[PDB]
Design a binder for this molecule. Sequence first.
Ligand SMILES: CCCCCCCCCCCCCCCCCC(=O)OC[C@H](COP(=O)([O-])OCC(O)COP(=O)([O-])OC[C@@H](COC(=O)CCCCCCCCCCCCCCCCC)OC(=O)CCCCCCCCCCCCCCCCC)OC(=O)CCCCCCCCCCCCCCCCC
Ligand SMILES: CCCCCCCCCCCCCCCCCC(=O)OC[C@H](COP(=O)([O-])OCC[N+](C)(C)C)OC(=O)CCCCCCCCCCCCCCCCC
Ligand SMILES: CCCCCCCCCCCCCCCCCC(=O)OC[C@H](COP(=O)([O-])OCC[N+](C)(C)C)OC(=O)CCCCCCCCCCCCCCCCC
Ligand SMILES: COC1=C(OC)C(=O)C(CC=C(C)C)=C(C)C1=O
Ligand code: SF4
Ligand code: F3S
Ligand SMILES: [K+]
Lengths: 117, 86, 164, 69, 82, 172, 106, 158
Amino acid sequence: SGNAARGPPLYDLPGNFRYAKEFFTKPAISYGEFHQQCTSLRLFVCAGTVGYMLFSFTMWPCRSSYWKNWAVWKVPGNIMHHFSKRSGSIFLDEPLKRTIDVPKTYAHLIATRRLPG
Amino acid sequence: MLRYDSLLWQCTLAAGIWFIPQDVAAISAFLLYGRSKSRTINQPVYVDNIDTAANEYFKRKGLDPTKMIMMRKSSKITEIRYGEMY
Amino acid sequence: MLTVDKFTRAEALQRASNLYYQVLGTNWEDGLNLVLDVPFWESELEKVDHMCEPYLCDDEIGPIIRNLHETVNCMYACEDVRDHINELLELSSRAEGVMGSGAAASEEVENMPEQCGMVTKAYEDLLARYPEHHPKIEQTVGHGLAVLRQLEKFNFKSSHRYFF
Amino acid sequence: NKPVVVNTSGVVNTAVLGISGAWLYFYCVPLRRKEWYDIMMDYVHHKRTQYASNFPDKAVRTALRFAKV
Amino acid sequence: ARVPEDIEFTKNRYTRRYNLATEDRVKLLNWNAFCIAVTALPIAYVYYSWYESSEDTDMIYRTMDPMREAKADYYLPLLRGH
Amino acid sequence: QPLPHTYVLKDLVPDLSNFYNQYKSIEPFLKRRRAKQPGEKEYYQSIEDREKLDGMYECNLCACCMTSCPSYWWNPEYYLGPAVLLQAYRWIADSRDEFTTERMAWINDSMRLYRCHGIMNCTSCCPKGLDPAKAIAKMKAAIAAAYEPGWTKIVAQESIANKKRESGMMYA
Amino acid sequence: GGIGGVWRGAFEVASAYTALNLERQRFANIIRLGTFCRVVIWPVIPLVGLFHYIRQRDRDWYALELLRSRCKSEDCAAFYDWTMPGSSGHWRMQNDLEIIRRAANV
Amino acid sequence: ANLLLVPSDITIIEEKNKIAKRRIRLLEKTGLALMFPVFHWRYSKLDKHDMYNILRRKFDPSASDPAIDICRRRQESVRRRVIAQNGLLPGLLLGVSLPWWSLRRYNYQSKLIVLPFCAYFGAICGRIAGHGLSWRWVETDRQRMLGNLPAKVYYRPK
Ligand SMILES: CCCCCCCCCCCCCCCCCC(=O)OC[C@H](COP(=O)([O-])OCC(O)COP(=O)([O-])OC[C@@H](COC(=O)CCCCCCCCCCCCCCCCC)OC(=O)CCCCCCCCCCCCCCCCC)OC(=O)CCCCCCCCCCCCCCCCC
Ligand SMILES: CCCCCCCCCCCCCCCCCC(=O)OC[C@H](COP(=O)([O-])OCC[N+](C)(C)C)OC(=O)CCCCCCCCCCCCCCCCC
Ligand SMILES: CCCCCCCCCCCCCCCCCC(=O)OC[C@H](COP(=O)([O-])OCC[N+](C)(C)C)OC(=O)CCCCCCCCCCCCCCCCC
Ligand SMILES: COC1=C(OC)C(=O)C(CC=C(C)C)=C(C)C1=O
Ligand code: SF4
Ligand code: F3S
Ligand SMILES: [K+]
């Protein structure tokens, strides 16, 4: 399986950097070596993307607390949550009894930037 | 030409024994996720007498019982429909 | 060629020598090697020609360019004959039928004795035209004719050196 | 229950690394990723002829002949 | 079947016969061209796709968090599910 | 029956001409950069070095492993096959040979070597109890670790050295 | 030629393009660009897409939190009920269902 | 026991508010036709017949009644779904024809190996393109929910 060896393994950082650099400096004179230049460049281009993402979420963090639900240990519980919802109809048989009327409170807030009172 | 110990027949039984179990589970999990959604959106609810149920429905929804074509789709399934639906 | 890039004679020599050994080192028998590589070789060969035009009479660059041109000529010529041999052998394989049974078998080449006389002549013409590329000619066309020999019993000069 | 701030960088970054790592691994590391290249090389490569009839050529040819080109 | 018996084989790089190797190189170009075009599908999804619950979301930001700096008191139970 | 997927010359007599040609291609003869100096005895090889060539030099070229590989059935004229590949490793592993890099560079081809998918039919049917599958795995690992950008040029230079050779399979 | 000669002539000028007519540099560049897409671009797009998903769902969720803080209400289920099927938990979706119930029922 | 499938509450409202019939456009017709049938082992999803009914009704575009607004929103979400189905067939056709022409000179084995996969890929690409050009990727979660509400529901007594 596979093809003829074209370059270093992935974990060989200095070797891959050489091929990635040649992508811009020395033009390839064969498909195999051009493909190697892309793969070695893929290592660094993909690392940079992940790097910026990590940087961006530290320097400009997400503000919601929903992401606490994306913790690894909470993943199994979330899976069970979607398989264990109460059976019934999506339509409401009876009016919902809530202590607050978010729809009306939201209409007034969007209109006066003030609570109903 | 044809033999039971042939690479073809022994690679076709091996593949079946190996994949059919995995696959049955995999498809079943999808079918299970489908039921979880379905039972939470429209759970099948069993009524005793269809005629009484239909009346309570027409009364509850303000629908004229004359304009509603009630048809029996299956031995255990009836269906009320609008008769004046485009 | 339309380009604004400028290269020294040392850089021109390096590019030409790199392309020459790259072509002469690549395995010509494998078709995918030539199909994938020739597009890159043609782009490079155009650039090499443009930058080596001043040095066609140079004592170092000149010979490299001449050998490079000869290798490309031999590469195209050999690939053509082996492509036809591959066509003949694939016609023969399809004639065997599905599973070798003959069930859905294609019709079988009728002038195969004559199609093998055409290829062998071409093989000899390549040998004369490209005397300094016999190793490549035997890798591609020579071995191709040895495969055909296993299907049809025909005579060519180097048949004995291919164990026939 | 009412914290002044919530730390999300650690959890989000962990998810990013896990999701990105799995996808990048699947696309780059395994030799299985070259399984489509092997199958084609084994069964499709160097198996072609121009001297044998095939439906796509016959179809294009007849439809041209029918329309007088 | 039968096969042509008067083929003029390629003699050099500038006197070339059209063969199935050259056709395969055109296939390489056309398949690679498809790949360039199909990249427009995944790139278009990422650019045009929006994940928003309703039209309210934008109105909330225009009236309550215009500078993306307003701080909301956090009640954990709301999104913790418990 | 005759050997699988071989051209039958008559009854049970196969046509193994391709197998003989492929073997000639690997050039199975010792190569050294310097010709034996006058007054020189045997080239030194330790017992341990000689032990490396133990399971590889006993191949009788029966061609069973060859005609048992599903990959030689499909691409006979492009894949060297288990027996030839093991013989190539025998000469790449022989401490006395001095052309290790040249041999590895030539064998490092998608069709020649990497058509082995590890079916292991070659090792199961070997009449001499050899393990061609293990040898091919070692040769693939050695090539992967030792590959350099300049290998292609090395192959080309050796091809130039064989310019005056006669008409037959050869390194090129 | 007649109408047939106009039909054939127009097809000859419409079926004129081939990749054999392309220049050498462009022929290679198309292959290079396609190979670059498969190797580099295709793996990156899924990752850029995850970034935007998180950022956009973070905007959707913090807006609910902003609404609850301004309302100063601890009736979480009013804002988002996690026991309701699909997306019906969101306050707006709950209101839509209420409108449907009120209109349909007597 | 006996089950009773009745029009859902959304259907009831849509029937009450319908002002007239609504011309079905050409792409809506083709999309509905090219839509796969659905076998209702249990009833939880909308099919091509329910979708036609939604698209054949007409509502007042200015009406400020909240109920009518829900109906119009649903009808728009159903329309985007229907016209999106027009991209599958183009994709599947090109996903077989283009590969077949390219491998027309290759052996039967190669067409069996390649064509099935390119067909599914082409169909998937066509579906992505159709759903994308029908503005499904910019729908909110409220729009998609209203367009997915079932039209038939099992009756729940009391
Ligand atoms: C179900 C949906 C999918 C269905 C299939 C979709 C089919 C359409 C694909 C369109 C995209 C472009 C395809 C390639 C264009 C050609 C490029 C090219 O020439 O490059 C050199 C090409 C190899 O390219 P490479 O990038 O150097 O090496 C590929 C490696 O993957 C090493 O590359 P890497 O290091 O970048 O590794 C990344 C790897 C990452 O790998 C993966 O993503 C893993 C999956 C790999 C296998 C998945 C498929 C398994 C099914 C069987 C596959 C074989 C049957 C054929 C399939 C259709 C092939 C078109 O990605 C790839 O495999 C490459 C991207 C394109 C792959 C397209 C086919 C598979 C799509 C799979 C999607 C779903 C996978 C789900 C897997 C299940 C688990 C989730 O070599 C050849 O051309 C060999 C040809 C030999 C025969 C002679 C043919 C004539 C020669 C003239 C030119 C012919 C060109 C056209 C070839 C195809 C004809 C059918
Ligand atoms: C020869 C070796 C070559 C090596 C090349 C290495 C390439 C590295 C590739 C980096 C790609 C990063 C792209 C991230 C895209 C995803 C993020 C996203 O969508 O965010 C939206 C964001 C905006 O979203 P936001 O959420 O961050 O917005 C909040 C931020 N403020 C408040 C400021 C608005 O914008 C971007 O996409 C910007 C991304 C910038 C990425 C910069 C990458 C530079 C890489 C330099 C590499 C240098 C290599 C040198 C080699 C030397 C060799 C000799
Ligand atoms: C800064 C430190 C860095 C450390 C780096 C360490 C990285 C490695 C650790 C793993 C991180 C990845 C976590 C998964 C992503 C977050 C989970 C998520 O979003 O789920 C929450 C979501 C939460 O959605 P929710 O709507 O239920 O959340 C609300 C929850 N309640 C109702 C309680 C309020 O879960 C679900 O929606 C349920 C389905 C989850 C399915 C998870 C499948 C696993 C996905 C990862 C596969 C990895 C493959 C590689 C392994 C090979 C396996 C064979
Ligand atoms: C003898 O008939 C056949 C071949 O010729 C050697 C094949 O290549 C192959 C191998 C190809 C595949 C797709 C496994 C098969 C199956 C076949 O029947
Ligand atoms: S089967 Fe064993 S002994 Fe015979 S040629 Fe192969 S490796 Fe040598
Ligand atoms: S059977 Fe063949 S695939 Fe390799 S393991 Fe032996 S040479
Ligand atoms: K040695």
